[PDB]
Each structure stands twice: as C-alpha cells, then as structure tokens.
Design a protein around this ligand. Structure first.
Ligand SMILES: [Ca+2]
Ligand SMILES: [Zn+2]
Length: 391
C-alpha cells in the first residue's frame, strides 16, 4: 500500500442504501456484498446512497454532506434557478476525518461516475455562480461552493456514460426507463405492483417534496414521478444522462490535476456483418436484451454526432461513452500502459460484462466479480499521494 485512503462506492440512476431493498446490495446483487468483500480483504470501504433520479449536482451535494456530516445544501442559486428546496436531509457523516486532511478513493458505477467527477470539481473549485449569488443576496454559502477541498485521491468509473447514452433517444424512453427500475426491483425479488408499507426503495426526493404514499405501489409511484419535476426538469438525471446533457456537464466538470482517474469500459454485444449494428450477447440481462440493446446497437443520428462508433454497448450505455468525457471536454484520456498517471483518464480497458453484471445485479458465473474489485482495490491502494519526476 502506498496509501491508506478508504474506498467509497457510488451508484448511478439506480441504487440504494445497504439497509434498503431488504439488504439486497446494489454493490453485489445476486453475487454477494462487494463492500464487505473488500473490507474482509483489508481495504476500508464505505457506501454512498444518493438520489437515483436526481441530477448529478443534487447527488454531488448529497454525497458531500453524507461524507463529512451536516444538512445537505443544494446552493441558493441552484435552488432558485430550478425551484426546489435549498436544504435536504441531514447526515451523521461517514468520514469526519475528511475535515482533517484525510482522503478517499471513489469507485463509481454508471451515472455515479458523472457525480464523482462533479464532486471533485466542486470540492476543488466550488461554484462561481454560487459565490456571487451569496455575495449579491447575502445568503449563507455552503463550504462546498467556496473551493479548496482536497478529499479525493482518485475516482474510478465503471460503465459511466461520460458522453451520455443514446438510450434516452428511444421514443418511449420514459416508460422503458421506469420498466428498468422495475427490472432491478424484480431482481431483488421486490414486486412493483404491491403497495409495501415499508420504504424499501427510497429515491431520496426530499428537495422535490416527492415520496411514495401509503397504499401506493411502485407502479403507481413511478407514474406520478414520470409527471413530476424529477422527470420533466433539466435539473435531473434524465437530462444529465442524454448526449447533450452530458456535453453540458463536461463543459464545466474538468479533471482535477491533483487526482487520479481510472475508467473501465463495458460491453456485452456482437457486431452483425451485414448491418454494421450491434446485438446483445447471450447472457445479457433479460431486460436490456429485449428492450434497450437493440436500440443502442442500431441507433444513428448524424446531426447529434452519433455514428458507428456509438453502437457497441453494455445493454444500457454505449461503450464509446465510457472511457472518459470527450464531447465538450478538454479532459485527456491515456490508455493504461502499466503506469497510472494523475490528472488524466487512465482507460483501464474494455471488459465483456453488461451493465448490471458488473455490480452483480445480474448473474454471470464467467465474470470473477470478486477478483475484479480486489485487483481494483490493490491498484488504488498503490497510488502514490505524491509523484516526483524522473527519467
Ligand atoms: Ca447475465
Ligand atoms: Zn437540483
């Protein structure tokens, strides 16, 4: 070990706390419990749960308070712009050590990779618009928006749509996306047509004043959410997930020079010789395979900049999006050569695993999930806090 910074796990547009979903773990799913696996092997590991459907910003603010402790502060400018509450939940703080020079590695899956990047950006640089708004209106300002925080030694992204996913361009994306939430609920053996009195799956929609009501099944809940500002606003995961939304985000969310970045690309497809299109591989999660992959492997859009390079996918995200932000980005991406460089995206390669298989939510006995996350842990723990120059 060159370092002793704990690992923090972070989910995407689906994800829940360790105590949610009757203990079925987002990180591990039907395979087991990834956090616990890592801890047992001697790598300190924690798990964040933030709003699945919320924007990367809201999630960044939630991640921060959850780490250091306090009441989630979304920023006054941001809250005024989008019309939700400035303050959210209160958290004990997973690691108050952060307020004392300590650091962390973030391992992020799916859209959690956008969130992680933005958290690094906000920690380091704060928000100019938030600082000016506070100066002009005399409102208080969260320390997240002042700049100067150095918590993150590294960020690792796994199947992250850094340039968005063409999934959002499906004519029926709205129904299909919530069908995706019902699919993951099903995986954990939770029904979507039952009005469970227990919380089960909290979408943490406190800023929007949205919550599942007594006598409301997840089917009925999702129908309301579809018509709510968490689905219709630009301050949403839905928007950040799109190609143009991802590009917007990339235009201000830059790689920190003091931080290591690792990206893992995922795919579960084969190419058809006659069509040029990609198709779901045998074994891909049932839902992706019928619903999502055929579109992802065949959808082109000349004006949007979606060509052939975008067709390979993992059932949910186009592989070409995952190695790092590129569209609207100045971030650099360098293929892993054996030396993890800092201040750049280290493309660790492409793995034959579909979205949900990489976190164990879908079975794949051919994928050694434990060896994957352990090797990763070993790698992050070998990162040198400081690197001098040499021949
Ligand atoms: Ca599978
Ligand atoms: Zn917001």
């Amino acid at each position: 070990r060159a370092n002793d910074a704990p690992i923090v796990l972070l989910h995407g547009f689906t994800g829940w706390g360790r105590e949610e979903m009757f203990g079925f773990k987002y990180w591990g799913g039907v395979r087991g419990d990834i956090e616990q696996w890592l801890n047992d092997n001697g790598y300190r590991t924690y798990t964040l749960a933030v709003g699945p459907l919320s924007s990367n910003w809201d999630r960044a603010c939630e991640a921060y308070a959850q780490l250091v402790g306090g009441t989630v502060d979304y920023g006054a400018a941001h809250a005024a712009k989008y019309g939700h509450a400035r303050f959210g939940r209160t958290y004990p703080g997973l690691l108050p050590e952060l307020k004392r020079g300590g650091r962390i590695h973030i391992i992020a899956h799916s859209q959690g990779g956008q969130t992680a990047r933005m958290l690094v950006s906000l920690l380091e640089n704060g928000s100019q618009e938030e600082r000016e708004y506070a100066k002009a209106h005399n409102v208080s300002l969260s320390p997240l928006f002042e700049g100067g925080h150095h918590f993150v030694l590294s960020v690792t992204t796994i199947a992250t749509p850094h340039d968005g996913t063409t999934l959002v361009n499906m004519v029926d994306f709205t129904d299909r996306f919530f069908d995706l939430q019902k699919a993951v609920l099903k995986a954990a053996a939770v029904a979507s047509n039952v009005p469970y009195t227990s919380q089960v799956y909290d979408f943490k929609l406190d800023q929007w004043g949205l919550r599942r009501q007594p006598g409301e099944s997840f089917d009925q809940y999702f129908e309301r959410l579809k018509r709510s500002p968490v689905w219709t606003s630009t301050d949403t995961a839905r928007y950040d997930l799109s190609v143009p939304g991802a590009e917007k985000l990339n235009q201000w969310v830059k790689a920190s020079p003091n931080t290591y970045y690792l990206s893992f690309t995922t795919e579960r497809t084969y190419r058809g010789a006659l069509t040029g299109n990609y198709y779901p591989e045998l074994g891909m999660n049932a839902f992706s395979a019928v619903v999502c992959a055929p579109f992802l492997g065949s959808y082109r859009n000349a004006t949007l900049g979606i060509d052939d390079r975008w067709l390979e996918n993992d059932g949910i995200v186009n592989a070409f999006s995952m190695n790092g932000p590129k569209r609207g980005s100045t971030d650099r991406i360098v293929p892993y050569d054996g030396t993890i460089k800092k201040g750049v995206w280290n493309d660790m390669g492409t793995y034959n695993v579909d979205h949900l298989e990489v976190i164990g939510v879908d079975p794949n006995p051919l994928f050694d999930i434990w060896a994957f996350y352990l090797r990763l842990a070993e790698q992050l723990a070998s990162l040198q806090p400081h690197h001098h120059h040499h021949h």
